[PDB]
Amino acid sequence: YINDNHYHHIVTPEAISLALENHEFKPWIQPVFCAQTGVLTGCEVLVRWEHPQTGIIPPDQFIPLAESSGLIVIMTRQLMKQTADILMPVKHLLPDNFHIGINVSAGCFLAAGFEKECLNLVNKLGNDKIKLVLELTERNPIPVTPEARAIFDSLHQHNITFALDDFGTGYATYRYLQAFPVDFIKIDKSFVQMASVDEISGHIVDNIVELARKPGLSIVAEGVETQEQADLMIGKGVHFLQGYLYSPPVPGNKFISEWVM
Numbered sequence: 157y158i159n160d161n162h163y164h165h166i167v168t169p170e171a172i173s174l175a176l177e178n179h180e181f182k183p184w185i186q187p188v189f190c191a192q193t194g195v196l197t198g199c200e201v202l203v204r205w206e207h208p209q210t211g212i213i214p215p216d217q218f219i220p221l222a223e224s225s226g227l228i229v230i231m232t233r234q235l236m237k238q239t240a241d242i243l244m245p246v247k248h249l250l251p252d253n254f255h256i257g258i259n260v261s262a263g264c265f266l267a268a269g270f271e272k273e274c275l276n277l278v279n280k281l282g283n284d285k286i287k288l289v290l291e292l293t294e295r296n297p298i299p300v301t302p303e304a305r306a307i308f309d310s311l312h313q314h315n316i317t318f319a320l321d322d323f324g325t326g327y328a329t330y331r332y333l334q335a336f337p338v339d340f341i342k343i344d345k346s347f348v349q350m351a352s353v354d355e356i357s358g359h360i361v362d363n364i365v366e367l368a369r370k371p372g373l374s375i376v377a378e379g380v381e382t383q384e385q386a387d388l389m390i391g392k393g394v395h396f397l398q399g400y401l402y403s404p405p406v407p408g409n410k411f412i413s414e415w416v417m
Contacts, residue, residue, distance in 0.1 A: 163210055167218050169225045175205060176230055182206050183235050183242065185411035188255065188376065188398045191390045196415055198255025198289070200378070200398060201239050202405045203231065223261055223296065232264045236273055240280040242408035247281050249416050256281075257289040257319065262298040265290075265307060274316055283315060289340065293321040300335040308336050319376065323347075325363045333367075341368040343394070345379025352384050365392050 165171070175181060181203055188198040205213040222228040236258060243250070258277075264270060278288050290311065298304050308318070319340035322329065343364050350357030368375045377389040380399030389397060406414065 165210065167221055169221065169227065172218060172222055172225065172227045172231075175207065176227060176234065179234065179238075180206055181231050181234060182407070183239050184405035184407055185239075185242075186398060186405040187403050187411070187415050188257070188396050189402055191395060191397065192386055194402075196251060196254075197396060198257065198287070199411065199415075200257035200291075200405075201235060201259075203235055203259075204405075223263060226263060228261050229264050229267045232258070232260065233273055236277045238408075240277050242412070243281055246412050246416050247285060250286065252285065253287055254285070255287045255289050255317075257291050260290045260292060262296055265292070265298055266304065271307065271311055271314065274311065275314060278315065287315075287317060289317045289319050291319045291321060291342065292336065292338065294323050294329065294332065295321070297332060298336065300332070305335055322364050322367065325367055329367070339373070340396075341365075341373060341375050343375065343377045343389075345399070348377050348379045348385055348389065348399070349381060351388055352382075362392070365394065369393075 182205075183201045184204050185199045185201055187196055188200060189195060190197050203215055203219075205215075205218055207213055219228070222231055239256070239258070243256075256277075260270075274288060274290070278286065292298070311318070317340065318336065318338040319342045320333065320336070320338045321342045321344055323344055323346075341364060343361060347357050347361050347364065351361045352358070365375060374395040375393070376396040376398060377385075377394045378398045380386050380389065380397050380401045382401060385399075386397055386401055403414070
């Protein structure tokens with residue numbers, strides 16, 4: 157197969173490792189809002205691989221290998237460090253209780269020192285100023301063990317919150333949530349985008365919302381692209397919106413320039 161393509165380069169573990177040495181994995185930041193008020197409540201940090209001069213490589217090109225290789229652990233550590241570096245100078249300008257969402261893979265969660273790196277980020281930005289939200293995914297789940305539950309529960313006891321990027325409402329999902337009782341349910345962008353278009357996807361979004369219908373739980377919808385989608389989500393009792401409608405992810409300096417100043 158001959159492909160007319162000058163920008164695809166087979167991603168190898170050694171390419172990821174060198175890129176980590178060169179600090180090429182950068183946190184882009186997408187704002188998150190209260191319902192349809194337009195009030196900024198927080199953000200999500202999203203990795204992009206900025207490789208000279210291929211350009212800005214999206215995570216679907218490298219995260220699966222970063223996870224299988226284990227290099228994701230260093231990557232996430234770097235992302236949390238850089239997030240602190242970006243926001244520390246302007247922490248006083250953030251709204252009180254600004255939420256910061258970081259994606260956490262099973263390998264990162266289980267790695268020695270994980271909680272310490274989370275608490276370091278929080279302490280740098282202010283424990284009484286921001287709220288860290290660790291985003292878990294059903295895509296590749298943390299095995300349920302008492303050790304893993306102790307990590308989860310300790311983080312919960314040290315002022316950190318969790319979200320689940322949720323895709324299903326089957327038995328395994330409920331079992332996972334019993335082990336790891338998250339604070340937020342996230343409706344994946346893949347379903348939000350189809351809700352108004354595909355009737356099945358609409359039912360699945362409804363099923364996911366019903367998951368969060370319990371005391372103390374709230375919901376974020378990501379991938380909100382249109383006013384119709386945003387309307388639909390708030391009307392279902394979705395608390396927080398994120399998406400291209402408001403802003404795509406942007407580099408750190410632009411996030412500060414556009415949303416903090």
